[PDB]
């Protein structure tokens, strides 16, 4: 494709958009294995994988 | 000993390597694997892997076969592949012809979510994304399908069937104890006959569990527990290939 | 449209129950959370509260 | 060691009691030689119930037997026919409940025609019916293998087509090798034969 | 040299699997009586898996018997009964499904129950053109020559366009059919799209998922 991909992609915790308490975060496309998560006031970052 | 790898045992043993799936998707899998196994005529439908994507809607890919014969010196399985975005409803992956199979290997990149996506090549060639997905799955399965040696056997009418008296592999840290699934049982072909630096084996000798990781395809993991004699394999991450193995090693 | 109802954080409840070691387990908990959403969302079965 | 035919009717299959019936059958000493779940069509059921041709109960009997899938079984035992008649009990469910309360008719039957099971009567009928539903199941090597019956069999059915085939071959006289002549005569037999037609497209 | 030709009607399942039919024949033998006398013969015809439509089965020596001439053969011509789903076209089936327009553009999965007792779910791989089609290899009738290979199921697509559209729906469609490429979008465009998506998929007051009344 002629469109360069973005560096961050969303990640969800449910296939339905009406679940009541679902976490939803982002994932790094440059460094694969780095994720960020947020639920209300509790957020996190973590990198698992090859460097 | 075992006749078909579990989904729960595989997802449990390969959790440390990042090979995990969402919990809601796990429950959906638990419910909707038998439904697809009965709708289609298959008798062994497991989870193959999970490919990432530019969206959050990763592709969960499952594989199932009815017959597994021995044709032209190779154990050939009439596999059928299915895909889904969530573990609820599965669709099918039709095979691709050779012209597309060669025009799909040049499309390097990360697949998008909608399986109705068309890539363009060069005149312009319009290729569907499901074709690319099937190409990548076929390539990974050709390069990586790993099972313990002697786990299969030949019967009358030349069908490869599970070795119900398999007593496990001695020295489960050596690559000589593992083989491609499409190697005939009598042949002494193993993973050692592949390129030397392609496969990495880490063996916990106390808990008796071995992990084989593909370095040519970095996201393919296989586990083999010797005490309970359970082996499984998953693939997480996209299906791109590590060309420059010589520099990394 | 889905009916507006008042439930608790059922996924958090399942997490707490699994932490303490009592209850039905996490996997059934995801199914209960989704079935309670099925019940509460029904416009015909207009519910003010599901538990 | 003999064997008999027995089918579980659609009424005991619609109620999900087939597996219990098989378990009871196996608990009493029987051995299920072959089983198959199948749905009869109208023509197949009418050919099946040939003996009660033009009877008063025939319409409802053939209409019930093709209302759902049934199970067909071959049961083997030294006294298989009489033992299966005894276990299967009296033929009328209302009479069965009074006479033998712990019998398959009493336990699963509901009506005079919905007796929930069907068994054979005599060894000739049993062999005929086993051949009807299991054409490839071997059996009875004594009545069939009999010099007088075997000569009659070859003369009546196989001989009329074979004599013409061996004549045509003697006329043609193909290569003296075995295989060419064998292939020629086999192709001739499979080409023009009395009972089967010729296929053209 | 007259022959009696009879249609023989089979269902697609029978031809797919290979039936074994028993047909009845009413044969007339001419005698000195003013009226004839007839008898019913039974004939076993064995149709092989996936025989082509129009196959002729000829029974030689069967047919009305005049006093002098040996009766000519009787012909059975194979024809298929109409099916609710499939129509065979040579060696492969054809399924004509009416498709919604948004299923064509966005893409969905068609559900088809094959002649064999297996269900089938086939994705829509691109924007289905009007009068276009889809092909699922190995899902047609068996080959009469080889009893293993089969044809390929052919889905013929006939779109079902919506009957009514409002002016705001047309505005949304025009905004969808002229959206700039993602590398040409302003920051205002991206913020507006994010806001609209968060509003259309609102879990309680959004219309992304509704229950039918």
Swiss-Prot record, chain A:
Family of the protein in this entry: Belongs to the flagellar radial spoke RSP4/6 family.
Function: Flagellar radial spokes contribute to the regulation of dynein arm activity and thus the pattern of flagellar bending. They consist of a thin stalk, which is attached to the a subfiber of the outer doublet microtubule, and a bulbous head, which is attached to the stalk and appears to interact with the projections from the central pair of microtubules.
Subunit structure: The radial spoke head is made of five different polypeptides (RSP1, RSP4, RSP6, RSP9, and RSP10).
Source organism superkingdom: Eukaryota
The encoding gene: RSP6
PTM characteristics: Probably methylated by PRMT1.
Protein name: Flagellar radial spoke protein 6
Full-length numbering of the shown residues: 358 to 408 of 459
Asymmetric dimethylarginine: residues bearing it: 41
Cell compartments where the protein resides: Cytoplasm, Cytoskeleton, Flagellum axoneme
């Amino acid at each position: 494709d002629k469109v360069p991909p973005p560096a961050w992609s969303p990640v969800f915790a449910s296939a339905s958009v009406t679940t009541r308490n679902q976490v939803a975060g982002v994932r790094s496309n440059r460094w694969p294995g780095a994720v960020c998560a947020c639920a209300g006031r509790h957020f996190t970052s973590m990198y698992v994988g090859w460097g | 000993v075992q006749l078909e790898p579990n989904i729960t045992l595989v997802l449990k043993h390969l959790a440390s390597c990042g090979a995990v799936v969402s919990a809601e998707q796990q429950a959906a899998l638990d419910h909707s694997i038998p439904i697809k196994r009965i709708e289609a005529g298959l008798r062994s439908l497991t989870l193959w892997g999970r490919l990432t994507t530019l969206n959050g809607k990763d592709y969960l890919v499952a594989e199932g076969y009815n017959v597994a014969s021995s044709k032209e010196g190779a154990a050939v399985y009439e596999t059928k592949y299915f895909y889904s975005q969530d573990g609820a409803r599965w669709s099918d992956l039709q095979p691709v012809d050779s012209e597309t199979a060669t025009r799909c290997a040049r499309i390097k990149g990360m697949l998008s979510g909608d399986p109705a996506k068309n890539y363009e090549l060069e005149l312009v060639f319009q290729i569907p994304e499901l074709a690319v997905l099937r190409c990548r799955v076929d390539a990974i399965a050709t390069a990586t399908s790993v099972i313990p040696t002697d786990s299969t056997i030949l019967n009358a009418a030349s069908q490869v069937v599970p070795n119900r008296l398999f007593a496990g592999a001695a020295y489960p840290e050596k690559l000589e104890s593992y083989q491609h699934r499409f190697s005939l049982p009598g042949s002494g072909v193993t993973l050692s006959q592949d390129l030397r630096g392609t496969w990495a084996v880490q063996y916990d000798a106390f808990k008796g569990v071995a992990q084989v990781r593909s370095l040519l395809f970095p996201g393919y993991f296989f586990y083999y527990a010797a005490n309970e004699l359970t082996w499984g394999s998953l693939y997480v991450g996209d299906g791109l290939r590590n060309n420059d193995l010589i520099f990394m090693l | 449209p889905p009916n507006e109802f008042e439930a608790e954080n059922m996924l958090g409840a399942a997490a707490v129950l699994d932490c303490l070691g009592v209850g039905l387990g996490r996997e059934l908990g995801v199914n209960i959370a989704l079935a309670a959403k099925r019940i509460g969302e029904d416009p015909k079965l207009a519910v003010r509260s599901v538990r | 060691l003999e064997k008999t035919f027995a089918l579980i009717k659609p009424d005991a299959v619609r109620a999900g009691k087939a597996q219990e019936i098989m378990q009871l059958i196996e608990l009493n000493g029987f051995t299920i030689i072959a089983k198959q779940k199948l749905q009869l069509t109208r023509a197949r059921a009418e050919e099946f119930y040939g003996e009660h041709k033009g009877k008063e109960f025939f319409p409802k009997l053939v209409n019930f037997m093709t209302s759902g899938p049934i199970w067909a079984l071959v049961l083997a035992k030294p006294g298989a026919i009489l033992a299966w008649r005894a276990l299967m009990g009296p033929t009328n469910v209302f009479k069965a409940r009074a006479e033998q309360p712990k019998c398959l008719r009493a336990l699963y039957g509901t009506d005079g025609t919905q007796n929930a099971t069907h068994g054979s009567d005599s060894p000739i009928s049993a062999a005929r019916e086993i051949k009807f539903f299991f054409p490839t199941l071997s059996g009875d090597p004594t009545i069939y293998a009999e010099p007088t019956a075997a000569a009659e069999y070859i003369t009546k059915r196989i001989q009329p087509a074979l004599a013409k085939a061996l004549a045509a071959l003697a006329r043609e006289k193909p290569s003296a090798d075995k295989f060419e002549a064998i292939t020629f005569v086999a192709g001739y037999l499979l080409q023009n034969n009395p009972n089967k037609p010729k296929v053209l497209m | 040299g007259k022959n009696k030709v009879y249609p023989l009607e089979l269902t697609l399942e029978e031809i797919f699997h290979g039936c074994l039919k028993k047909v009845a024949h009413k044969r007339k033998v001419l005698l000195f009586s003013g009226e004839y006398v007839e008898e019913e013969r039974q004939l076993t015809v064995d149709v092989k898996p996936g025989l082509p439509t129009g196959t002729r089965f000829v029974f030689e020596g069967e047919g009305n018997k005049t006093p002098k001439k040996e009766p000519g053969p009787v012909v059975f011509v194979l024809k298929p009964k109409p099916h609710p789903r499939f129509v065979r076209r040579g060696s492969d089936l054809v399924h004509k499904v009416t498709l919604p327009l948004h299923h064509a553009l966005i893409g969905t999965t068609l559900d088809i129950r094959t002649l064999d007792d297996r269900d089938l779910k086939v994705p829509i791989s691109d924007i289905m053109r009007p009068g276009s089609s889809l092909t699922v290899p190995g899902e047609g009738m068996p080959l009469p020559a080889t009893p293993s290979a089969r044809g390929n199921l052919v889905i013929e697509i006939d779109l079902l366009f919506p009957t009514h559209l409002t002016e705001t729906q047309k505005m949304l469609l025009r905004s969808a059919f002229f959206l700039p490429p993602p590398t040409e979008q302003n920051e205002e465009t991206k913020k507006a799209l994010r806001d609209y998506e968060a509003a259309f998929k609102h879990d309680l007051k959004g219309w992304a998922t509704v229950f039918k009344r």
